[PDB]
Design an enzyme around this catalytic site. Structure first.
Site, PDB file in Angstrom:
ATOM      1  N   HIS A  78     -53.706 -18.526 -33.283  1.00 40.57           N
ATOM      2  CA  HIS A  78     -54.811 -17.426 -33.799  1.00 40.57           C
ATOM      3  C   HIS A  78     -55.833 -18.238 -34.336  1.00 40.57           C
ATOM      4  O   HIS A  78     -56.380 -18.052 -35.487  1.00 40.57           O
ATOM      5  CB  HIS A  78     -54.342 -16.420 -34.313  1.00 40.57           C
ATOM      6  CG  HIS A  78     -53.773 -15.531 -33.611  1.00 40.57           C
ATOM      7  ND1 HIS A  78     -52.363 -15.274 -33.714  1.00 40.57           N
ATOM      8  CD2 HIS A  78     -54.111 -14.741 -32.804  1.00 40.57           C
ATOM      9  CE1 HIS A  78     -51.859 -14.242 -32.861  1.00 40.57           C
ATOM     10  NE2 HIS A  78     -53.226 -13.923 -32.228  1.00 40.57           N
ATOM     11  N   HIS A  82     -58.409 -20.055 -29.249  1.00 36.95           N
ATOM     12  CA  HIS A  82     -58.002 -19.030 -28.582  1.00 36.95           C
ATOM     13  C   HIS A  82     -59.308 -18.005 -28.373  1.00 36.95           C
ATOM     14  O   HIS A  82     -59.582 -17.594 -27.286  1.00 36.95           O
ATOM     15  CB  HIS A  82     -57.043 -18.259 -29.403  1.00 36.95           C
ATOM     16  CG  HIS A  82     -56.723 -16.728 -29.105  1.00 36.95           C
ATOM     17  ND1 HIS A  82     -56.156 -16.490 -27.840  1.00 36.95           N
ATOM     18  CD2 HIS A  82     -56.936 -15.619 -30.079  1.00 36.95           C
ATOM     19  CE1 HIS A  82     -56.065 -15.262 -27.814  1.00 36.95           C
ATOM     20  NE2 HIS A  82     -56.398 -14.684 -29.341  1.00 36.95           N
ATOM     21  N   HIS A 118     -62.751 -11.436 -32.288  1.00 36.93           N
ATOM     22  CA  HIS A 118     -61.609 -10.445 -32.292  1.00 36.93           C
ATOM     23  C   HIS A 118     -60.506 -10.931 -33.111  1.00 36.93           C
ATOM     24  O   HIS A 118     -59.542  -9.918 -33.526  1.00 36.93           O
ATOM     25  CB  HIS A 118     -61.225  -9.981 -30.780  1.00 36.93           C
ATOM     26  CG  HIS A 118     -60.235 -11.324 -30.184  1.00 36.93           C
ATOM     27  ND1 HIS A 118     -60.749 -12.384 -29.691  1.00 36.93           N
ATOM     28  CD2 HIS A 118     -58.889 -11.285 -30.106  1.00 36.93           C
ATOM     29  CE1 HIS A 118     -59.398 -12.893 -29.524  1.00 36.93           C
ATOM     30  NE2 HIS A 118     -58.593 -12.188 -29.802  1.00 36.93           N
TER      31      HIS A 118
HETATM   32  C1  LIG Z   1     -42.479  -7.958 -26.429  1.00 42.48           C
HETATM   33  O1  LIG Z   1     -43.442  -8.955 -27.060  1.00 42.48           O
HETATM   34  C2  LIG Z   1     -44.587  -8.205 -27.733  1.00 42.48           C
HETATM   35  C3  LIG Z   1     -44.854  -7.308 -27.295  1.00 42.48           C
HETATM   36  C4  LIG Z   1     -46.040  -6.275 -27.979  1.00 42.48           C
HETATM   37  C5  LIG Z   1     -46.819  -7.244 -28.895  1.00 42.48           C
HETATM   38  C6  LIG Z   1     -46.370  -8.473 -29.158  1.00 42.48           C
HETATM   39  C7  LIG Z   1     -45.571  -9.005 -28.438  1.00 42.48           C
HETATM   40  C8  LIG Z   1     -44.746 -10.448 -29.011  1.00 42.48           C
HETATM   41  C9  LIG Z   1     -45.184 -11.582 -27.893  1.00 42.48           C
HETATM   42  O2  LIG Z   1     -46.431 -11.939 -27.806  1.00 42.48           O
HETATM   43  C10 LIG Z   1     -46.682 -12.782 -26.797  1.00 42.48           C
HETATM   44  C11 LIG Z   1     -45.825 -13.718 -26.206  1.00 42.48           C
HETATM   45  N1  LIG Z   1     -46.297 -14.387 -25.180  1.00 42.48           N
HETATM   46  C12 LIG Z   1     -47.485 -14.528 -24.879  1.00 42.48           C
HETATM   47  C13 LIG Z   1     -48.462 -14.041 -25.554  1.00 42.48           C
HETATM   48  N2  LIG Z   1     -49.840 -13.864 -25.568  1.00 42.48           N
HETATM   49  N3  LIG Z   1     -50.022 -12.753 -26.430  1.00 42.48           N
HETATM   50  C14 LIG Z   1     -49.358 -12.473 -26.990  1.00 42.48           C
HETATM   51  C15 LIG Z   1     -49.163 -11.654 -28.030  1.00 42.48           C
HETATM   52  C16 LIG Z   1     -49.022 -11.943 -29.612  1.00 42.48           C
HETATM   53  C17 LIG Z   1     -50.032 -13.037 -29.995  1.00 42.48           C
HETATM   54  C18 LIG Z   1     -48.855 -11.164 -30.845  1.00 42.48           C
HETATM   55  N4  LIG Z   1     -48.060 -12.860 -26.578  1.00 42.48           N
HETATM   56 MG   LIG Z   2     -55.599 -10.138 -32.501  1.00 42.72          MG
HETATM   57 ZN   LIG Z   3     -56.593 -12.655 -29.977  1.00 39.05          ZN
END
Ligand SMILES: COc1ccccc1CCOc1cncc2nnc(CC(C)C)n12
Ligand SMILES: [Mg+2]
Ligand SMILES: [Zn+2]
Length: 338
Positions: A78, A82, A118
């Site tokens: 983050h 990003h 964001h």
């Molecule tokens: C079931 O996993 C999730 C369901 C809902 C929200 C969060 C997650 C965790 C896994 O997140 C991620 C895993 N790979 C890639 C990815 N990109 N963006 C995200 C959200 C992260 C930055 C919060 N990612």
């Molecule tokens: Mg965010």
């Molecule tokens: Zn983001």
């Protein structure tokens, strides 16, 4: 500041000068050196005609862009790179999907500025951690929910309220009010818990067909596009997916370690001793990313390639899962790790 001097007096470079493939869905914005990203933001804003349409003052815009970049910390995922990659994907959507047939110009502009802002001041920990650790952010926003997203929005407002940084200060009272309301809605839509709550409304809109005269359809599409930008690292090649998984899990495991030190049991995905990355990645692809890009494809036929890349990246994780099992002996030829 010399960065500002150059950004203001050197002139805005043409978008095509950055890379010949800059406006393609195959381009990886993370390949651009961090020192060139503030100029790339100005080039995209100019290519989208926002500078001229909204008569944005150049000294103000240059200060705003640098202040937004400075507003990001350096956690593994983050960070400013990003935010820049999320902003670049919003630009790709504008260039490849003819958004002007769906949204008002002020909404497309708000989506882009929201992409930049964001994740402002992200500390590498999620909403649940804020509440569990009783952080100042939780004291301010836990009763309303989406703790971090409320902070990101408040940081964006704080930048606009810094002298010499208000890129909308010449807007009419109504247009200014509209911009800040769109920014709130779009930044709050980045909470994946909000995405999951509105998922059935998104499916229903795709089923009945997008109605440009329906204000609720505009709000829903803005939410879907923001989510599509936020997860866009999953629409590139395997190399990007793999690198992004390393960054995300480095950030998650750091949180998991803090949770253990607090005496709490972290979630499996946050626990470096329990997490099984290929399974977690396949699960995120199947239940979160693939349905988002399938919805995007249903609304925009030209977005078909994005869904196909996310689906292919999910098949690549299944294909490499066997490599997570130690066969034979490790490189050093010893079983000391036991
Ligand atoms: C079931 O996993 C999730 C369901 C809902 C929200 C969060 C997650 C965790 C896994 O997140 C991620 C895993 N790979 C890639 C990815 N990109 N963006 C995200 C959200 C992260 C930055 C919060 N990612
Ligand atoms: Mg965010
Ligand atoms: Zn983001």
């Amino acid at each position: 500041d010399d960065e500002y001097t150059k950004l203001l007096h050197d002139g805005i470079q043409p978008v095509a000068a950055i890379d010949s493939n800059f406006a393609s869905f195959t381009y990886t914005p993370r390949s651009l050196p961090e020192d060139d990203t503030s100029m790339a933001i100005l080039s995209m804003l100019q290519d989208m005609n926002f500078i001229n349409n909204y008569k944005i003052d150049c000294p103000t815009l240059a200060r705003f862009c640098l202040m937004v970049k400075k507003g990001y910390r350096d956690p593994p995922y983050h960070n400013w790179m990003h935010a820049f990659s999320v902003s670049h994907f919003c630009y790709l959507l504008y260039k490849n999907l003819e958004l002007t047939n769906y949204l008002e110009d002020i909404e497309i502009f708000a989506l882009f500025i929201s992409c930049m802002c964001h994740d402002l001041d992200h500390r590498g920990t999620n909403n649940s951690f804020q509440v569990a650790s009783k952080s100042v952010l939780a004291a301010l926003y836990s009763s309303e929910g989406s703790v971090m997203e409320r902070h990101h929005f408040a940081q964006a407002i704080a930048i606009l309220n810094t002298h010499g940084c208000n890129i909308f200060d010449h807007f009419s009272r109504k247009d200014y009010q509209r911009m800040l309301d769109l920014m709130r809605d779009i930044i709050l839509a980045t909470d994946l818990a909000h995405h999951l709550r509105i998922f059935k409304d998104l499916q229903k809109m795709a089923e009945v067909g997008y109605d440009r005269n329906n204000k609720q359809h505009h709000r829903l599409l803005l939410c879907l596009l923001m989510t599509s930008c936020d997860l866009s690292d999953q629409t590139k090649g395997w190399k990007t997916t793999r690198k992004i998984a390393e960054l995300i899990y480095k950030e998650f495991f750091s949180q998991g370690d803090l949770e253990k030190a607090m005496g709490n049991r972290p979630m499996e995905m946050m626990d470096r001793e329990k997490a099984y990355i290929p399974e977690l990645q396949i699960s995120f692809m199947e239940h979160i990313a693939m349905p988002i890009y399938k919805l995007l494809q249903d609304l925009f036929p030209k977005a078909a390639e994005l869904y196909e890349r996310v689906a292919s990246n999910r098949e690549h994780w299944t294909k490499v899962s066997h490599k997570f099992t130690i066969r034979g002996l490790p490189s050093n030829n010893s079983l000391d790790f036991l």
